[PDB]
């Protein structure tokens, strides 16, 4: 129960962080969002793709 | 037949199995049946707190009413604390989890 | 109006793809994993 | 001309479902009786039911 | 009530047996009943219940079905509907009740 | 409802017919076990003639004798009912006759007997029961004409005053027929409208039904609807706990894990080829799910490096090049490759541009129709 709920919390927190971080930004290098949120390039890329789909 | 307390026990076991299988609507149906049958007989502290904890788990999973989920979790925690039961740490963990997911850490 | 007599004369909405392939997507993928 | 022509239901309420605590059962029943017939009446057609227009609440003084 | 102004005086007795069945059918036609719903059994379980009660029983079975994301009404659902509709509140003041032998 | 006959019989026959499983010792043993148990003499003769099998007279003779004796007692009882009892029992005797005919597999005899019984009968319930037996015989022998005919028949009878259990059963029958005729949109609609109410255990197990619902849903549903009605679905996700290879297939696509998606798609292909209702659809299902996967990946990109896309899909660069070329040519995808510097640009059309093209096409159709009308009637 706690594992599932906390995983969803992680997902929502990451989504909010990406949205706020990239609000003051048109075209952006993905390495920059990775630097700003302190995650891996691959993970941020996958989450961004999921957001867009 | 007799032993309506065991009726409630079996119904809650079925609800736990339903939720484990992830059929939340049917788990909720089983929980509502268990609670209606529990509001006609004596619920020892153990069964009352177990019903409360299962209610908390189901509300946490499905309805997204984490305030009520916390309420039921806390009733379960108080009951298990009164009974001096091993599984009160789990209830307290769920309490903290509700207080987190409510975005009030 | 007039039948042009001077001219002598499944239920699946198929649309090509009836090609000849090394199975659709089983042996291809097997060999793909094998060479990767 | 036909001039498009009041008394109650214009002082928009303030309390909310987040404000009311507990009484999940009462909220469920009042909602199924009051709101859903107005938001999702297809759910009622499917079962083939007449929505329960009219419900009564018991209770101590407050 | 003189038989010069109101000539006839019809009575509407509370639907008896199998008249309750007729009302159950009438108010359950537009419904989703399973193979194994015994409207007769519902009728017997409902003694001395007015046609309003029959309508309410069907409606409450339907609302119970609405509850569990389901479009089917079952015998047990009708039973719970009967219980929830025919609530016979009874005074608990045993003294006021035993006043009369 | 009864099993007239076990459609597992058709499954076994078609599995044997497939060349890969012709020499299946088990399959053969189970098929003949069912044949002997239920005494299908004409069907067994047809199997022997079609599959070029060495007949076993020592048991075929006993099987014929049993069939003859049972039919004789049935029709004797029918005559007795005719000369002694009323329609209420003459009809039942005829029903038993037709039931034995179908259970032995004499297609012509069963069809004739059921037609006669339907002509005799007047009760709606038993009329529907006979129609259902006819639908299931039609499904057994894949006779599209008969299946469709009884299908509108059954719709008419239920519309003329029916019941919800038979509505669900007809819905499942329509779904199986839609899978047969490759109408997976209707198949998904019906299956998802009657997954919570699976009552037709004669056609297939509930595991098989949920697997079919998942397959048809994935091929026929958009991502929003798929999430709402197949991943957030009570029963359709309950059974996927017992089915581990299908849960992975569905959740790979939804979570956008694609290499696992192709692994599970190869699994599903080899499963459906063996299957008997999906057998003339596996090429199409595989191809359309591949297109769904590629379009899903490229729906959130504008220039996807071919190497990265290959790594995501768990394949190479050459395989991806070949298949993207094929699908772009077919016109399904919206993507143009650039092989010098391997990059797959995505030329998706904007909303305005797509609306323009739709207006051109649909207006062209309407213009053709009106032009025909006017040219015809003006002069």
Curated annotation (Swiss-Prot), chain B:
Phosphorylated by AMPK. Induction: By FOXO4; expression in embryonic stem cells (ESCs) is mediated by FOXO4. It is found in: Nucleus; Cytoplasm, Cytosol. Highly expressed in embryonic stem cells (ESCs). Expression decreases as ESCs differentiate. Component of the 19S proteasome regulatory particle complex. The 26S proteasome consists of a 20S core particle (CP) and two 19S regulatory subunits (RP). The regulatory particle is made of a lid composed of 9 subunits including PSMD11, a base containing 6 ATPases and few additional components. Component of the 26S proteasome, a multiprotein complex involved in the ATP-dependent degradation of ubiquitinated proteins. This complex plays a key role in the maintenance of protein homeostasis by removing misfolded or damaged proteins, which could impair cellular functions, and by removing proteins whose functions are no longer required. Therefore, the proteasome participates in numerous cellular processes, including cell cycle progression, apoptosis, or DNA damage repair. In the complex, PSMD11 is required for proteasome assembly. Belongs to the proteasome subunit S9 family. This is 26S proteasome non-ATPase regulatory subunit 11. It comes from Homo sapiens. The lineage of its organism: Eukaryota, Metazoa, Chordata, Craniata, Vertebrata. The chain holds residues 160 to 264 of 422 of the full protein.
UniProtKB/Swiss-Prot annotation, chain D:
It comes from the Eukaryota. It is found in: Cytoplasm; Nucleus. Belongs to the AAA ATPase family. Component of the 19S proteasome regulatory particle complex. The 26S proteasome consists of a 20S core particle (CP) and two 19S regulatory subunits (RP). The regulatory particle is made of a lid composed of 9 subunits, a base containing 6 ATPases including PSMC4 and few additional components. Interacts with NR1I3. Interacts with PAAF1. Interacts with TRIM5. Interacts with ZFAND1. Component of the 26S proteasome, a multiprotein complex involved in the ATP-dependent degradation of ubiquitinated proteins. This complex plays a key role in the maintenance of protein homeostasis by removing misfolded or damaged proteins, which could impair cellular functions, and by removing proteins whose functions are no longer required. Therefore, the proteasome participates in numerous cellular processes, including cell cycle progression, apoptosis, or DNA damage repair. This is 26S proteasome regulatory subunit 6B. It comes from Homo sapiens. The chain holds residues 141 to 209 of 418 of the full protein.
From Swiss-Prot, chain E:
GO terms for cellular component: blood microparticle; cytoplasm; cytoplasmic vesicle; cytosol; cytosolic proteasome complex; extracellular exosome; inclusion body; membrane. It is found in: Cytoplasm; Nucleus. GO terms for molecular function: ATP binding; ATP hydrolysis activity; DNA-binding transcription factor binding; general transcription initiation factor binding; proteasome-activating activity; TBP-class protein binding; thyrotropin-releasing hormone receptor binding; transcription factor binding. Its main location: cytoplasm. The keyword Aminoacyl-tRNA synthetase does not apply. Belongs to the AAA ATPase family. This is 26S proteasome regulatory subunit 8. It comes from Homo sapiens (Human). The lineage of its organism: Eukaryota, Metazoa, Chordata, Craniata, Vertebrata. The gene is PSMC5.
Swiss-Prot record, chain F:
It holds the Pfam family RPN7_PSMD6_C. The keyword Chaperone does not apply. GO terms for biological process: proteasome-mediated ubiquitin-dependent protein catabolic process. Keywords: Proteasome. This is 26S proteasome non-ATPase regulatory subunit 6. It comes from Homo sapiens (Human). It comes from the Eukaryota. Component of the 26S proteasome, a multiprotein complex involved in the ATP-dependent degradation of ubiquitinated proteins. This complex plays a key role in the maintenance of protein homeostasis by removing misfolded or damaged proteins, which could impair cellular functions, and by removing proteins whose functions are no longer required. Therefore, the proteasome participates in numerous cellular processes, including cell cycle progression, apoptosis, or DNA damage repair. Component of the 19S proteasome regulatory particle complex. The 26S proteasome consists of a 20S core particle (CP) and two 19S regulatory subunits (RP). The regulatory particle is made of a lid composed of 9 subunits including PSMD6, a base containing 6 ATPases and few additional components. The lineage of its organism: Eukaryota, Metazoa, Chordata, Craniata, Vertebrata.
